[PDB]
Amino acid sequence: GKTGDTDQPIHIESDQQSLDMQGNVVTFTGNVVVTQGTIKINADKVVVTRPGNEKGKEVIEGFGNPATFYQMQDNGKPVKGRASKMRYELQNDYVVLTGNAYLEQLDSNIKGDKITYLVKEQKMQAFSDKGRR
Amino acid sequence: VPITYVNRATXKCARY
Numbered sequence: 001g002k003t004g005d006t007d008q009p010i011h012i013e014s015d016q017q018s019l020d021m022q023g024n025v026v027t028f029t030g031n032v033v034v035t036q037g038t039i040k041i042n043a044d045k046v047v048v049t050r051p052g053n054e055k056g057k058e059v060i061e062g063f064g065n066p067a068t069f070y071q072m073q074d075n076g077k078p079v080k081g082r083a084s085k086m087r088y089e090l091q092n093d094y095v096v097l098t099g100n101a102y103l104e105q106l107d108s109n110i111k112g113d114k115i116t117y118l119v120k121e122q123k124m125q126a127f128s129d130k131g132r133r
Numbered sequence: 134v135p136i137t138y139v140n141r142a143t144x145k146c147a148r149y
Binding site for chain 1: 137148
């Protein structure tokens, strides 16, 4: 990769936290820190869970009524965004945003209410549904 | 990246 991706973790100081022993669902509440690598998140509620027999295939969501995300993007095209929920996946590109979802980068800005983004990158997509599921 | 969280009731930490 580069170097630093296992010196700086996701760090979480917290008040109203819980950590399960069995499936290992985790939740933080009321006051929560979230920073990692070159990224910051702000939230009142944070959750992390593991669809993982293998590791780093963990999934995280953050809620700040609205939550916000901030990224010093590698290539000199930094980005930040805001939504009722924000989401990330720990072996993966993908961020997703829902409820009043807004993002702005050197490449583009978008308002919508259901938007996906790629942390390695400068590209975004909105998914205007009509029962397509 | 790893996750590394700290609990109010011990002031000390774990990985995930």
